[PDB]
Amino acid sequence: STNPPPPETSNPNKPKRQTNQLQYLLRVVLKTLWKHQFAWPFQQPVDAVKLNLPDYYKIIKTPMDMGTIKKRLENNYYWNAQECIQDFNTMFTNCYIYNKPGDDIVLMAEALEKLFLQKINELPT
């Protein structure tokens, strides 16, 4: 019937900072992944109504996507890099939970996750 409201992308009462690692997570890691040929399913919240996946938000109770991440980064929502990295890992984990090995979407995630890991292996100070 409906989608849940999307995750918040601003919250005045949350502590936040710009750090060099967070600037890098947007400029390099996110904006690079974003251009990947497999990025599209992850660029916005799962529209379970459009996709006719009525079970999605029965199974996935902490939704996350790169559009939300992008907006959090642009709005300086995070206190540190680790908070953002945690949202990427929630996004990947959700994909692996809802789907099964060998599914096209899981292969897409696996690729993006490898790339993500490659890019965050070394961060700014």
For the chain, breaks with the C atom over 2.5 A from the next N come after none
CB distance 46 to 5 below 8 Å: no
Q: From the CB of 11, what's the least distance to ligand 62V, in Å?
A: 24
Please state whether 101 falls in left (phi above 0), alpha (psi between -120 and 50) or beta. beta
Q: Which of residues 49-108 bind ligand 62V (CB under 6 A)?
A: 51, 95, 98-99, 104-105
Helix (H/G/I), strand (E/B), else coil: 48: coil
Q: From the CB of 62, what's the least distance to ligand 62V, in Å?
A: 13
C-beta of 9 vs 90, nearer to ligand 62V: 90
- Binder among 6, 7, 41, 67 for ligand 62V (CB under 6 A): 41
- Binder among 22, 42, 81, 92 for ligand 62V (CB under 6 A): 42
Q: From the CB of 114, what's the least distance to ligand 62V, in Å?
A: 17
Beta carbons within 10 angstroms of residue 95's beta carbon: 23
C-beta of 57 vs 79, nearer to ligand 62V: 57
d(CA 87, CA 46) in angstroms, rounded, equals 15
Q: From the CB of 23, what's the least distance to ligand 62V, in Å?
A: 26
Return the axis-axis angle of helices 104-120 and 81-98, rounded to nearest 10°: 160
Which residues bind to ligand 62V, rule: CB under 6 A?
41-42, 46, 51, 95, 98-99, 104-105
